[PDB]
Design a protein around this nucleic acid. Structure first.
Ligand SMILES: [Sm+3]
Ligand SMILES: [Sm+3]
Lengths: 566, 584
DNA sequence: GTGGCGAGC
DNA sequence: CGTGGCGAGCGCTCGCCACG
DNA sequence: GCTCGCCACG
């Protein structure tokens, strides 16, 4: 009767619609649009959804087959057209749209028609020949397109629902918590519109970089960059500046900041180091958006000053600022440090020793000969360690989730739960997570450090029993083979080590997750364990990984680096 | 747009491709590779050639600069890599190769990292220290290797096999290759090819390996690495021995000498000859004499070097070895060899007297009857006070002595005139196998006895015509050759030696025809020995046209025997000679 | 028998 | 996010004929 | 004729 995709689509609509303040962010014609959607037949809405999920290109009705809708879709198509949501081939007025709708033989045929010198050239060459040259509709036949603007309305609706959600989700269950809305994230309708346009631009730029289209990426970023200033004096940014960090990330300014940050990577990829420096200086000159990115900025900036521009003195100043700033995490900190020594110890910098005066005072390797992790596991199977897990960060993060579930999801923290479809509270990757949950955190982590083995086992079982299967981003319900395996592991790790790991994850998930060794192996009898990082040929320890090997070693956990040789 | 080096490389490769029978000496996969090169983009080929002349090591990608090829080399690198011609830093797995690639600061950094002793230490000591540190089946070396690669960065290396293929192709192009090849213009002649020099692919390969070894040995000796030069030489010695009884070697012995120099055996013979000098340096004089005996036991390779060989053997028997009787025997056998040049011959006789007059060998007098009666003259020697180049001081003195003109041109002066007088015979048609390709500066038999014997009728007629030629004839013929070949590259002729055609005509007028005929005869008959003895300087009074050939010798610089022989020859033909000594 | 190449699909 | 349909791109083989 | 990159679908 009622297909899943439409159910999901209708859930999102209901959630946004019943909440009146967000509903105030749409004009009358737009509400009229949603009304029109509601007036569609079911077959119409189902077709509309199936089409709406595709990026908008013209599609021949002979491309259309949907048993789940109708064995002949035409009356559905008529309905959607009459409603003003679909358009037919009679509205084809863009040359490129028609050119690209035609398959290969047709374009070849048409090429033969006009006495094009070559009819058998590449498609793109014919496309270009036609464009220079500038009935294709006469030969094409019946076609349909999703109408632009109404899809942009639904686009913004969907955007609003979850700004950052699998297909199974309509079947899937999220954790329970309570809704807490108090602050308005978008100042007005137009603010939402500017937000959405920034989003799409960032998505274009990202796409470009992924495909190596760096020159186009730079143009698109340069346009974005222009459009920004000419806004970044606008009123709404005001109330955006008043939003907490974990909500501020969903503002127009934050998005364009991210855009500028990719611009840095673009400039560097193109070896335009100078321009890059300016963007870095610019980003570091404000502290309003993306504090989390400050560490990345200084770290890249120093490298730009130190090794390609080679203007050493302001490089020194940069590094010193870098270490001096509060928001730098440990990884970038250490990287900056090693660079500080590096500049400090070359005859090139024999003189400028006097500018290095603020300076702070800031592992076991082995080798063996398809899967490098599985080879390691086989070896430790020989070494008496009958259990082992290749799960990287999710293993430990999963333990974190199992030990601190009720705190991660505790009531009383405004705006971290905004709807019933979140995998985690919104402040998770910010320091304010910990500062906002300090009393429960501090007392329970102390409770962990001193807890006897079986207590850990008991708490793990409790969470496992009460929570298994539901989506929590911290927990991979398939990382462990069984509750028992997890109980055996917590028994081997013991209370202080667990305490240490949970501390790191709670203080800083974004970087703890990225720091954890691939492997963990243990003997189920003796509870002797080793935490092993695995490196094949051309695989190297990152700075983050080195920091966490040290940290785990400090907690008394035994760590090892296993290199597989070709 | 289409750069010179690619023009040049394409000429060499095409010239080779156009001859099918030489092409039969390569297998399919190698030709396939060259096909693929030909199919590459222009930027691709440009890059390969620019990398090709750069020597075989890994090279850091941040050092490569080629604006004229590509502002971004990434996709070109990609093309050459996919095509199997280059490799990237991803393929660097030898610890030593990466340790060799690293700059000084980087190696210093790495050294401090592993708490290596003497970190301000020298590069090479740190390299050796790392390799020992690695030797802590299997080893801790691989991990060190990773980290050295990490600091080194993106790097490329020219692939070994394909480079070797192009290597052999260039080798074969010029059995006789600086930049100017694309633009330089050769004399005309017609190709006359009848011989296959290489029996098959592996014979060429053996040939090439001998070449590279000789190259190494020469390089080693030059750097004073006598120990490594000796090991390399001994390896080569076995490598020549372990080639014994090869079929193709018989075929090498069948072809004429002037092409025999283009065989593996000739090259190893040259290697053995330097081997003599090597062992002498290291005082292995025993091995020396033996090796020399070995060289002289055959007359198949480098007969031209026999004069050097006999003379050095005599010396070795004569002195430190102090084995006097066989020394006498050696000198006598030496003189009995007919192919020995006059210079060393004079040297050898001089040694016969020299031993005869130290009481040590008075008893052995019965062995002293071989004596020629040709005793040693002294012509006109003079001295000047030095302060500058010795030649230039001499020139200044002769201008004070009324010789307003002067040229410091050594042999190339007369050789140039030789070239002007006999050009069309030097390049004449009808002599098979002296011209093999379009890029020769000289006929292949030029420095070989068959040059003269193969062109005797035309030569005898032309030297007779020169001996009798009046001034006007000489000047006219010189102008003819000058005009018809001006600009063309002739190995005899230096187109910068003379001030102008007119000066050259004035010089032939001053020295005169009979002398010219005499000189051309000697150098035509025996170039490698005539060309070498000619005086550094030549001055003349432009009024009387009286000229002098002057050899200049600063303190501690002495007449060589060939120079002394040619002063005597020149005086005999009536030319006047003088020797100028500069005092410090 | 072999190579080298050009045309099919 | 991982996998399948599926179009676009592209290589391949084989076969001819000159020739030792 | 094949494999590979791209876009629907749970
Ligand atoms: Sm279907
Ligand atoms: Sm340059």
């Amino acid at each position: 009767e009622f297909p899943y995709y439409l159910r999901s689509f209708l859930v999102v609509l209901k959630t946004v619609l019943e909440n009146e303040d967000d509903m105030l962010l749409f004009d009358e014609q737009e509400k009229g649009i949603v009304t029109k959607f509601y007036q569609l037949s079911a077959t119409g809405q189902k077709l509309y959804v199936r089409l709406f999920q595709r990026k908008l290109s013209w599609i021949k009705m002979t491309k259309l087959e949907y048993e789940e809708i109708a064995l002949d879709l035409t009356p559905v198509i008529e309905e959607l057209t009459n409603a003003g949501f679909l358009q037919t081939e009679s509205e084809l007025q863009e040359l490129s749209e028609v050119l690209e709708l035609l398959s290969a033989p047709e374009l070849k045929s048409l090429a033969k028609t006009f006495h094009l010198v070559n009819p058998n050239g590449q498609k793109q060459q014919l496309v270009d020949a036609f464009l220079k040259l500038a009935r294709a509709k006469a030969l094409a036949g019946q076609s349909v397109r999703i109408c632009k603007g109404p899809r942009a309305v639904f686009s913004r609706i969907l955007l609003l629902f979850s700004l950052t959600l699998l297909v199974n989700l309509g079947r899937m269950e999220f954790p329970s918590y309570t809704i807490n809305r108090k602050t308005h994230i978008f100042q007005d309708r137009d603010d939402l519109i500017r937000y959405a346009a920034a989003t799409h631009m960032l998505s274009d730029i990202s796409s470009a970089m992924a495909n190596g289209n760096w020159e186009e990426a730079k143009e698109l970023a340069q346009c974005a960059k222009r459009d920004w200033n000419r806004l970044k004096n606008h009123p709404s940014l005001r109330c955006h500046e008043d939003l907490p960090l974990f909500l501020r990330c969903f503002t127009v300014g934050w998005i364009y900041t991210r855009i500028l940050s990719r611009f840095v990577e673009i400039l560097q990829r193109l070896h335009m180091y100078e321009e890059a420096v300016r963007e870095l200086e610019s980003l570091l000159s404000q502290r309003i958006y993306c504090p989390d990115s400050r560490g990345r900025w200084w770290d890249r900036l120093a490298l730009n000053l130190h090794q390609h521009l080679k203007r050493l003195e302001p490089t020194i100043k940069c590094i010193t600022e870098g270490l001096a700033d509060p928001e730098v995490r440990t990884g970038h900190r250490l990287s900056l440090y090693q660079r500080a020594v590096r500049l400090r110890e070359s005859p090139s910098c024999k003189k400028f020793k006097h500018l290095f005066q603020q300076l702070p005072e800031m592992v076991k390797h082995v080798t063996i000969t398809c899967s490098v992790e599985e080879l390691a596991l086989a070896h430790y199977r020989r070494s008496g360690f009958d259990q082992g897990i290749h799960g990287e960060g999710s293993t430990f993060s999963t333990l974190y989730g199992l030990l601190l579930w009720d705190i991660i999801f505790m009531d009383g923290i405004p705006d971290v739960f905004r709807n019933a479809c979140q995998a985690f509270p919104l402040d998770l990757c910010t320091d304010s997570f910990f500062t906002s949950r300090r009393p429960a955190l501090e007392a329970r982590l102390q409770l962990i450090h001193d807890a006897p083995e079986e207590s850990l086992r008991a708490w793990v079982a409790a969470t496992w029993h009460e929570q298994e299967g539901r989506v929590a981003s911290l927990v991979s319900w398939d990382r462990f083979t069984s509750l028992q395996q997890a109980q055996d592991l917590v028994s081997c790790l013991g209370g202080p080590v667990l305490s240490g790991v949970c501390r790191h994850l709670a203080a800083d998930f974004r970087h703890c997750r990225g720091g954890l060794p691939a492997l963990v192996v243990w003997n189920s009898q003796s509870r002797h364990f080793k935490l092993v990082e695995v490196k094949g040929p051309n695989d190297r320890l990152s700075h983050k990984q080195m920091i966490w090997l040290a940290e785990l070693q400090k907690l008394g956990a035994e760590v090892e680096v296993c290199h597989v040789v070709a």
